[PDB]
Ligand binder design. Structure first.
Ligand SMILES: *C(=O)N1C[C@H](NOS(=O)(=O)O)CC[C@H]1C(=O)NOCCN
Ligand SMILES: *C(=O)N1C[C@H](NOS(=O)(=O)O)CC[C@H]1C(=O)NOCCN
Ligand SMILES: [Cl-]
Ligand SMILES: [Cl-]
Ligand SMILES: [Cl-]
Lengths: 245, 245
């Protein structure tokens, strides 16, 4: 009978066409079935890098570190390499421009004891926060696979994480990436650069009228010049599968 | 001293270019200033028609008539003129396809006494539900102006309406119309067809990185062939004002 996970190796052509290597994982929520070009890499756990902004946001909101999505976190005045980081942000714009220093402040205020407890409650990856509480997702011990990202996102979608429904709704709002009459994408990018292998991430879901497709992709990323391929390769797969036009 | 409300008659050219007549009203939230091509029509009160799905959704959720935005409302098997209505819906798709029969059932469950009480609590328009409990917003006594639509939407944006924050967040999600890196539009269309003058509505807001612009427009609409002009004329104004590219 039907399998929970199937391999579609033809998706490899979208990686090969872009001289890239990696994995796309899709989950069809209505059918409760998943699909991937590489089931082994789908289960390979990596540093989450900026995709950790999703659980970090949830925990900061539920503990009151962040009051709501419009509370301002002022620039600390240190000029950093990414110009959009050198300004004041709220939760929405800090996720959109992936403003690491704002989320490091969130993590410091959460603190290691509460961070560990909440990642255990979330069943999140290997749940390991060894390192600095404000960098373990960049250069510490936490690891999460693409399929574990989907597991986490499915709980978030259904408001079933062990945090308030309010925090889950706010974070799903902050994840909004694209919307038109054909679909809504809620997602977060990431780029793990400090520990080899350097990889790019894109995790989230596509909302249709009558279904939701969760996705999690990662790919080898030796330089930042290829970062647009995270979304491009994913969208090529979504187009091949007739999920988006 | 600066003016809270200012008239910009140059927007009339966008109506004339499309052989149309109507009003666009904008509110700049950061500046606390409003702008319109027609100050009198901005304050004239009309039937809300399908823009009433915003307060109706809020009331249905807060009263428990609708449990959440994924609860399925099954098609009643009656084949109606609009093909997208002849389907099962949830709150998200019922708002998107503006599925009147679903919202008439909400209104019947709410009932006259609770509907009236809640519209008074919302300060919604003239607060008058005279007529049929399931059609007063189409052919009964309720009236709301474009400026009153903005007032109501600003309360919704800030979670200040007299319903749970949860219901307000769910409805703001259901209002999602378009999103890209440049802006998010949350809005609801309507077409008042039963009492003259027939008018098209578009009410909502445009979220930018650092500001939000509320808008409410209505325009004479003798035929459904012109309904695309509601968004087109509004967007021409937003482009003229450099709010969207
Ligand atoms: C997170 O992965 N970040 C922050 C920022 N994210 O941009 S995105 O990859 O488009 O979401 C830039 C890349 C990455 C970092 O540079 N983080 O700090 C160093 C650890 N990789
Ligand atoms: C509400 O304004 N409705 C329902 C539907 N809305 O579509 S929209 O105008 O694009 O938002 C069509 C127009 C209008 C009605 O006609 N409603 O009356 C009951 C069905 N004729
Ligand atoms: Cl981060
Ligand atoms: Cl949203
Ligand atoms: Cl309606």
């Amino acid at each position: 009978g039907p399998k929970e996970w199937q391999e579609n190796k033809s998706w490899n052509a979208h990686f090969t066409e872009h001289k890239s290597q990696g994995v796309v994982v899709l989950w069809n929520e209505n059918k409760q079935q998943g699909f991937t070009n590489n089931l082994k890499r789908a289960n390979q756990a990596f540093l989450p890098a900026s995709t950790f902004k999703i659980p970090n946001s949830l925990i900061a909101l539920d503990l009151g570190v962040v009051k709501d999505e419009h509370q301002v976190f002022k620039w600390d005045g240190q000029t950093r390499d990414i110009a959009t980081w050198n300004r004041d942000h709220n939760l929405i714009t800090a996720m959109k421009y992936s403003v690491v220093p704002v989320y490091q402040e969130f993590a410091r205020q959460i603190g290691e004891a509460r961070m560990s407890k909440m990642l255990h409650a979330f069943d999140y990856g290997n749940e390991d926060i060894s390192g600095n509480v404000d960098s373990f997702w960049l250069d510490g011990g936490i690891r999460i696979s693409a399929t574990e990202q989907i597991s986490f996102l499915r709980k978030l979608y259904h408001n079933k994480l062990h945090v308030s429904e309010r925090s889950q709704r706010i974070v799903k709002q902050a994840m909004l990436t694209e919307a038109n009459g054909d679909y809504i994408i809620r997602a977060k990018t990431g780029y793990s650069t400090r520990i080899e292998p350097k990889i790019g991430w894109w995790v989230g879901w596509v909302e249709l009228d009558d279904n939701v497709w969760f996705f999690a992709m990662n790919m080898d990323m030796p330089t930042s010049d290829g970062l647009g391929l995270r979304q491009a390769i994913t969208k090529e797969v979504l187009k091949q599968e007739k999920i988006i036009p």
